[PDB]
Amino acid sequence: MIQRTPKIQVYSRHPAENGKSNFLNCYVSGFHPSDIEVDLLKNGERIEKVEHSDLSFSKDWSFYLLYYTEFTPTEKDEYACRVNHVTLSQPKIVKWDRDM
Amino acid sequence: NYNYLYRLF
């Protein structure tokens, strides 16, 4: 039974600008099986109303999904994506960088 | 337009 770990990218849909509505995406990919836990974090608290693209896979059969919410970035507020999987000993947290 | 042929292993 094949088990791949998820690649994780967290980023804004549009070029971030303080005070302006935007979308915060978190894109997991390249992972088997399809069970995966993804949260979007605003200063350490999970964002309740996140939505996710429907489950799909690449040619090599590795699943990919996107998670997104509307959000307005600021100078000081930190956002992050947290992933847990069978192939991870602990949840892995990736912070969002505006410059990336 | 989805597939219409379904077969067992």
Binding site: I2, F57, W61 | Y2, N3
Partner: protein, 280 residues
Amino acid sequence: MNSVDGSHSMRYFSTSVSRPGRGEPRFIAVGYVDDTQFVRFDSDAASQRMEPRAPWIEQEGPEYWDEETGKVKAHSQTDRENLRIALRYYNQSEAGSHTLQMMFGCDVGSDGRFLRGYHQYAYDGKDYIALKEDLRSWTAADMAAQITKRKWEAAHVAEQQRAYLEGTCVDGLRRYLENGKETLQRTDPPKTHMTHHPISDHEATLRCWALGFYPAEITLTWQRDGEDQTQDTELVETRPAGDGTFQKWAAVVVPSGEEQRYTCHVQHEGLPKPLTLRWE
């Protein structure tokens, strides 16, 4: 919109996961045309119906949904049973969870006519059975999958599936490409900019940025004095932006002061021109 082939593609992707003790396995199916999702089905969803996921597919009558909803559900029953057939071939218990996925679809040429066909299965992330590119023979990886290969050669399954692939499959793809012309045939060129982050006073990461493009096929390349710095360039997977477009960046590590000897090159279908970007 395969820049190399002139070709477009319809694909359906199906994933079924078994839930020992938590109910019957879960079936998720999605259909794409090129890089646009247009249709979805979730066995656990309340609607129990094939659901739109693209604005041009809503332009469709009741007989369309009643019939697609019928086939996708017929699929869920058929791969649920195959989860047991496959579990019995590999001699494994009902205690553990298992993932069975399918993919099928067809490609149309610049001609607008059939070019390519696909019909492939995968158990627990590992290629199980697959219709060879000629659509007349099968490939089976396991010995277990070869049981299916002869049962399906003796049921003449390859010829009928080729009928779906040279038949409804190309006809559906051509019709979608006309109904969603303003989406599927319309190229969004990438917006291009680049950024400088000093890592020391010795070195420096120069990153080339492409946002909001479609189709997702793109090429970014770095050049030192006009030679490809494939080695020290970092490339990320193309990612979805949520608006139907995609983003992708390429970054290289550069000696401080020699940033002008470095050139970024963007090849994308939506450009009449490969771009060149300098730090400048």
